[PDB]
Amino acid sequence: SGYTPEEKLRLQQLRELRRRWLKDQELSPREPVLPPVIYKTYRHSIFAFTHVLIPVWIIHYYLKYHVTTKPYTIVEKKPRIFPGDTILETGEVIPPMKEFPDQ
Amino acid sequence: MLKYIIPTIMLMPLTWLSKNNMIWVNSTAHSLLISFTSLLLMNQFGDNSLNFSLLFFSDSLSTPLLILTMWLLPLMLMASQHHLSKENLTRKKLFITMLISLQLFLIMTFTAMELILFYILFEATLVPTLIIITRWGNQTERLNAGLYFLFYTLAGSLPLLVALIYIQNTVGSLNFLMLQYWVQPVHNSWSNVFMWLACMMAFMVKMPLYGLHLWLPKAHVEAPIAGSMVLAAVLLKLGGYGMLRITLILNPMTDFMAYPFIMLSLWGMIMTSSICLRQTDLKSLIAYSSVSHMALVIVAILIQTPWSYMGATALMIAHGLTSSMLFCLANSNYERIHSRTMILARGLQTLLPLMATWWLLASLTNLALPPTINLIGELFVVMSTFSWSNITIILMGVNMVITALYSLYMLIMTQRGKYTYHINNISPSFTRENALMSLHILPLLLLTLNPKIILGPLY
Amino acid sequence: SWDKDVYPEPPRRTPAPSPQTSLPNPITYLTKAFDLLVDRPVTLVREFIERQHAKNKYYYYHREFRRVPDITECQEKDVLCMFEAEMQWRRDYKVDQEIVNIIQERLKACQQREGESHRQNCAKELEQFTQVVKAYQDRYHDLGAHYSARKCLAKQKQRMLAERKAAKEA
Amino acid sequence: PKYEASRLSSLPTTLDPAEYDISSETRKAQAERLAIRSRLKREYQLQYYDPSRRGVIEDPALVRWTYARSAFGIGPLVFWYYVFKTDRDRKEKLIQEGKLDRTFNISY
Amino acid sequence: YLTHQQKVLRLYKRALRHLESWCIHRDKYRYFACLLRARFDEHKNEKDMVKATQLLREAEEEFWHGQHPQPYIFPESPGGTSYERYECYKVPEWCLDDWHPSEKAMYPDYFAKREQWKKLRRESWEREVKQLQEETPVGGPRTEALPPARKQGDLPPLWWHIVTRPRERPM
Amino acid sequence: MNMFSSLSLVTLLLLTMPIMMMSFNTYKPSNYPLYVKTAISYAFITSMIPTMMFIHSGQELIISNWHWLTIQTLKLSLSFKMDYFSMMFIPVALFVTWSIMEFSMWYMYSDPNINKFFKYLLLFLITMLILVTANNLFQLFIGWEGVGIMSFLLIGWWYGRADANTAALQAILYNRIGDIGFILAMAWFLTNLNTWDLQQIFMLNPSDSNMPLIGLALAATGKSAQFGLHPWLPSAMEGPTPVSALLHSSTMVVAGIFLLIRFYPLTENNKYIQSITLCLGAITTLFTAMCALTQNDIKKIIAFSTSSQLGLMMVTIGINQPYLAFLHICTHAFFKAMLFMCSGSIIHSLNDEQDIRKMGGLFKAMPFTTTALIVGSLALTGMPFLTGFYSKDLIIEAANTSYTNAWALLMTLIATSFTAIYSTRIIFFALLGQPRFPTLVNINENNPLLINSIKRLLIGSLFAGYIISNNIPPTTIPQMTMPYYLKTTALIVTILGFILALEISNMTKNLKYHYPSNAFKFSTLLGYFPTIMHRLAPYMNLSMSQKLPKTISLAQMKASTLVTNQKGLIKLYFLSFLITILISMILFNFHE
Ligand SMILES: CCCCCCCCCCCCO[C@@H]1O[C@H](CO)[C@@H](O[C@H]2O[C@H](CO)[C@@H](O)[C@H](O)[C@H]2O)[C@H](O)[C@H]1O
Ligand SMILES: CCCCCCCCCCCCO[C@@H]1O[C@H](CO)[C@@H](O[C@H]2O[C@H](CO)[C@@H](O)[C@H](O)[C@H]2O)[C@H](O)[C@H]1O
C-alpha cells in the first residue's frame, strides 16, 4: 500500500518547493521598513485625572445644574427613621418604643 | 414647495451643460445641497399641517418621506457611476435625467393636497422607473420585469382613478384638507365594498401585499442598483403613504374590509420570512425581506390606531435606509464577482474587513436591534396589534425569530466561513463604496437620538 | 426651578448621625473629598457662566391661545369655523396628554420615595391617577388614528345617551 | 438489534449490505464515476492554476442549480381568519356589556 | 473502491480508538488492545474469501453495537474542538497583489523574493500544460493522480496552489 | 445624593470611554487590553462607593436624566435604578470581569485581533450593566438584546469554523424564542397599565398577572437556558474560554434569573407562576446535572454545571425567595468564573486539549491551578463556610421547609447530589492518576497575569459569600427552626455524592470491559434533545417553503387569433355585415 515511484517523486519535488517557499516567508533584519514606581503612579495618576475626575466634574455639573433642576428627575427613597432618631431639618425627636417583655 | 421643485428641475440643465468628466461631481454635489435644504420642512406644528399653497402641503407624514427621497438621489448617483463608466456620455446624462425626473415626481407626489394630483404624480413615477429597469438592466428578463411591474400597477391604479373621480362628484372636492372636514361615514353596501377595494388595491400592489408581491422580486433581480435603491426605499412607500391618506374616507367600512388583507399580511410575513431562509439570489432574498417588513406596515395602517400609525411611519423610514443599504452591499459584491448567487463568494470578512462591519450593521438593523428606529417602528406595531387581538403576538414573535435567522444567515453565508479558492479578484473596498454604506447607516443610527421626527402626525 | 404645587414633594426628614462605633466612617471622608475636589470647582465654573448670563438678560414667553368656538357651535360643513374648532381641539388633546403625564410622574415619584411603605402612603396619588385616566379614557379612547373633534363629539353624545337612558330606567 | 435508518439518520456505510458484495458491474460503474470526477477536476485545475487568470471560474453546475431553483394557500388564511374573528367578536361583546376590564387602557 | 484489506485495516484502527475512549487509563487500554489484536490475528489467514467477508460484516455489526457514543477526537481532526479554528487567519497569497505601494515598501526584501516566484510560475506554466496533454489519454484523465516533472528544470505540473498554500498557523 | 448619583453614573461613563477612544482621539493600540482592563479595575473602585452608602443607610435612588421620547401618555426617559440588586451586582460583575480581562491578556495573547476581542468583552459588560440598572422595560430590552448579540459575536469568534458559526446562530435562535415572552410582557403592561416603568407597574400591582408573568418566565427560560430552550448554553462552548467565563458568571445567563428577581413584587402574589417556575427549575437542575455526569469535554462539564446552577436559581424563584436567588447569582459568579479560568489554564498547557480522558496527573505539575480548582469545586458543592455555602444551603433549607411541589423538592436534592459527582469527575480525571497527555511537556502556569487573576477570584470564592451575607439588609424572615434531617440534607446528600462518585471513578481502573447502558447513552447524548430537535425542527421549517398572469395573457393571445385570423375575402366581410344588421333588428331592436 506504499507510494508508487511516481507518487514519491512528485511528493519529493513538491516538498522541495514548499520548503523553499516557507523559507522565503522569513522577514529580513530591516523588515518592516517603517516610516520615521514613579512611572507607575504618574501613569495611574494621569489615568485617574482623565477617566475619573474630568468625567465626574462633567457628570456632577450636569446632574447639579440641568437634571436636578427639573421635577422628579432624581428621586430618592426617603431615609428610614428608627425609634430614637433626631430629625435634622426640624429638630424633632422620635419617641422610643414601648418596653419589651423579657425574652 | 417651489423651493424644492425648481432646484430639482435645474439639476437637469446642470447635468447636460456640465463638462463631460464633471457630470457625476456636479449632479452629486448639487443634489446634496438640495437634500440639505429639505430640512426646512421640519417646521411642523402640533395642530396644523404646513400648508404652502393651493397645490402642496407638508405634514409630519410627508416630511420624513421627502427628506428620504432627496437624500436618496445623491446616494443613487454615487452607486450608479461605476457600472455606467463605459456608457457613452449622452446615455449617462439621460440616466441621470431619469433619476432627477423621478425625484421631481416623488416630492410632488408626497406634497399634493388634491388626490387626483397625487394620482397623476403617483402614476408618473412609473415611466422613469420602468425606463431605468428595461434600458439599464443587465439581463434578458428585465423586459418581462418591466411588463409585470407596469401591468400589476395599472391593474389596480385604473379602478383607483374611477373611485377618485366618483368621490369628487359625490363630495365636491378631493383636497385632503377639505376631506378631513367633509368626510362622511361609509355605510354597508356592495357598492361601497367595491369603492373600498378600488380605493385600496392600487396601494396594496405597491406595498406589496402578500399574494400580490411576485412582481417585486422579479423587478429587483433585473433592476440596476439605483433602480433597486429607489424602488425599495421610496416607491414601495408610495403605497404606504397612499393608504395612510385614503383610509380617512373609508371608515367605518375598514372595520370588516381589512380582515382578509390583515390575514394575508399576518400570514404572509411569516411565509416571506421563511422563504428568505432558502433564497439563493442575494437580491431576491432582500426583495422577499421587504415584503415581510411591509406586511407589518399594512397591518398597522389597517388597524388604524395612533400607536400603529406611528409605528408604520417609523417602519417605512427605517426600512427604506436599511433595504437600500443591503442592495448597495449586495451590489458591491456583484461588481467584483458578477453574480448574485449568495453561496458563490464566501468568507469575505477575511478579504474585506471593513465591508464586513457594514454588513454587520445592516443586518443588525434588519433584525431590529434595540434601540434602532427599525425596532421602534416594529415594536409600536407589535404593541398596537396586541390590543387589536392578543393572539397576534404569536405570529409577531415567530416572525421576529425567523427574521433574525435569515438576517444572520445572510451575514454568516457571505462574510464568514472559508473564502472561495478560485475567486481571486476581490480587490480592496473603494472609498466610494465605504462612503456609500456609511451614508445609509450613520443617519439611520443618528435617528435613534431623536426618533420623534420620524413618528408622523400621530406623534 | 419648577412649581412645587404641580410637582409636590413632602417635607424631608433626615435623621442625624448617631455613631455606635469608634471606627471612622469612610463615607464621611469621601463626602468631604467630593465637596472639595468636585463640587467647588464645578460651582466655580457655573458661577462664571452665570455672570456672563447676567450681562445679557433676554426673555421668552409662553404662548397664549385665545378660546374659539367649539365644534358643537359649527354649522355642518362650514370649514372656516370647523378649522379653528378642530385646531383648538387638537391643542387641548395634546395638553390633556401632558396632564396625564404629570399625574403619572407624581405617582411614580411617590412609589420610589415611599419605599416599602408605598402601597399605603401613595393612595392619594393612586386615586388621582385613577380619575384622570378615566376622564382621559372617556374623552379620547377608541377614536382611531383619524381622530377629530367631530368623532370626539359623536362619542360624548353616545355616552350622554347611555347615561340618559340608565337614569330614566331608575 | 439491527440499525433502522431514518430520513434524518442514514444507514452507516459499514452496515450497508451492498458495500461488501461488489461485482464487476459495480466496479465498472465506480470507475466510470471516478473518470467523470477526474475529467471535471482537470478542467477545473487548468483554470485554477492558470497564472494569468483573474476572476471567477464560472461553474455550470452552480448556474444550473440557481436556475433550476429560481424557476396551503387559503386554508391558513381561513383558519387564522376564524381565530382572530372569533376572538375579536368575543372581545367586542364584552366591552359593550362592560364586562372587559380597561381601567388603565389609554394607549392603543 | 476500498479493498477488503483496506476495510479490515480501517476497522481495526477505528475499533482501537473507540476502545481507548472506553478504557481511558493506559494500563487498562494496553491490556484490552492486545486482546482486540488477538481477535484479528485469529482470522488472519482465512483464505475462504466468502468466510472472510462474513467475518468483517459481523465485526462491523459488533463495532456499531459497542462503539463509544462520545469517542475521543484529535482537536484538529474533523469534528474536534480546534477543527478549522485558524481558517479565519488564512489569507490567500494573491491578496498581496492589491497591497498599496506604501505597504509593499515596508517589506522590500519579501516582495522582491515574491516576484522571483511569480516569474518561476509564469515561465513554467506552458511546459506543465504540455506535459499534462502528452500524458493524458484520449478519454481524459481516468484518475486524479498527477505526475512528477520528468526533465531538469521542469516543475511538477500544477504545483502553485500546493507549494504556496497558507501556513497551518498563519498569524 | 450628589456624590451617590454622580459616582454611580461615572461607573457607567468610565466603561464606555475605551469604546469612544476607538474613534482614534487618543488611542494606544500597543496595549489596548491593558487600557480596557485598567478601566474595569477603576470602575470597580468607583462603584464600591455607592455600594458602601447603600450598605450603610440603605440609600437608593432613580436617575431619569434624559427625556428621550413621549408617545402621547407614555413618556420614555433614560432612567437608571440604583437599588439593592444593582448596587450589589455591579461591583461583583466588575470584580469578576476584572479578573477575566487580566486572564484574557494571557490566554488570548497570540490572537491577532486581541484588541477587538477586548472591545467586544467591554461591550458585552456594558450591555449587561444597561440591563441590570434599567428602570423601564424598553431600556431593559436594549440590554437584553445587546447581550444576546454580543454573545453571538463572541461565541462565533473563530468565524472560519462552521461549528462556531452554527453555535453562535443557535444562541440567537433560542434567545429570540424567549424574546417572544419579553415583548408579550411589554405589550400587556402597556395595554393594561399604560406604562413600561417598573415604578408604575409595582404601584398599580395587577392581580391578573398570569399573562405578563408567563411572558417573563418564557424570556427567562431562553436567557437562563432552562429546560426546553437549554441546548444553546453547552453549545456556546465554541467561544474562546474567556467568553465562557464571562458568559456563565457575570453577564448573559443570569439575566433571565435577574429579570424574574426584578419582578418579585408581582410574582410573590401569584402562586400559579411560582408553581411553574419551581417545576421548570427542578427539571432543569436535574436534567443538566445528569448530562454533566458523562461529558468528557471539560468546558461542557462546566457549562452543564452552569445550567444546573441556573435551574437551582429558578427553583429559588419558584419558592418565593427572590433575594436568595439573587445571592446565588453573586456567589456563583466568583467560583464559576474561576473554574473556567482553571480549565483554560489546563487547556493552554496541554496545547488546546479539552478531553479529560487525555489529562490526568496534573495535581503536582500545576500546583496553583490545582489549588484554585479544588477551592472552586468545594465552593460549588456547598463546602461549609465557602462562598457557595452562604446561598445554596439557605436555598436548600428554605425549599425543604416550604409549602412546595414534592416532586420538585426531590429533583433539586438529587441534583445537589449530582453536583458532587461531576465535580469529583473533573478533579479525578484531570488532576489524579497518571499523565495521559502527549509526551512533549509544555506545562507552565508561571505567568503573573494568570496567577493574579485566578488569585483574586480564589479569594472571592473563600470570603465573598461571608462578606456579602453580613452586609446586606434582611428583607425576609429566614426559616431557622427545622428538624435535624431537614437542616443537614444538603450536606448529607453532598457527602453521599462524593462517596458515590469516588467508587465509580475508581471502578474505571479495573480490568473489566463494560458495554453501554441506555442510561449512559441518554446522559452522554443529552437526552437526545439536540439530536432530534436540531434535525427535525430545522428540516420541517426549511422544507415548508417548497410546499394568474400566465392565464390572462393566454386568454388575450387566444382572443387575438380569433379576431385577426381572417381570410381577407370581400364576400365574407360583407356577409357578416348582413348578420350584424339582422341581429341589430331581431335581437336588440335598435331600429326602435
Ligand atoms: C432665441 C431663443 C432661443 C434662446 C436660446 C438660449 C440659449 C442659446 C445657447 C447658445 C450656446 C450653445 O452652446 C453650444 O452648445 C454646447 C453647450 O452650450 C457647447 O458644447 C458643450 O459640449 C459638452 C456637452 O456636450 C460640454 O463640454 C459642455 O456642455 C459644452 O462645452 C458648445 O461648445 C456651444 O457652442
Ligand atoms: C380580498 C377581497 C375581500 C372581500 C371582502 C368581501 C366582504 C363582503 C361584505 C358583505 C356585505 C356587503 O354589504 C351588504 O350589501 C347588502 C346589499 O343588498 C346590504 O343589504 C341590503 O340588501 C339586502 C338584500 O339582500 C336587504 O335585505 C337589506 O335590507 C339591504 O339593506 C347589507 O346591508 C350589506 O351588509
Ligand SMILES: CCCCCCCCCCCCO[C@@H]1O[C@H](CO)[C@@H](O[C@H]2O[C@H](CO)[C@@H](O)[C@H](O)[C@H]2O)[C@H](O)[C@H]1O
Ligand atoms: C460540601 C463539601 C463536602 C466535601 C466532602 C468530601 C467527601 C469525601 C468523601 C471521601 C470518602 C472516603 O473515600 C475513600 O477513600 C479511600 C482512599 O484510601 C478509598 O479506599 C479504598 O479505595 C481505593 C480504590 O480501591 C484505593 O485507592 C484506596 O487505597 C483504598 O483505601 C475509597 O475510594 C473510599 O473508601
Ligand SMILES: CCCCCCCCCCCCO[C@@H]1O[C@H](CO)[C@@H](O[C@H]2O[C@H](CO)[C@@H](O)[C@H](O)[C@H]2O)[C@H](O)[C@H]1O
Ligand atoms: C387585469 C389587468 C392587467 C392585465 C394586462 C393584460 C395586458 C395584455 C398582455 C398581453 C397579452 C398577450 O401576450 C402574450 O401572452 C402569451 C401568454 O402569456 C405569451 O405566450 C407565451 O407564453 C405561453 C404560455 O404562457 C406560450 O404558450 C406561448 O407559446 C408563448 O409565446 C406571449 O408571449 C405574450 O406576448
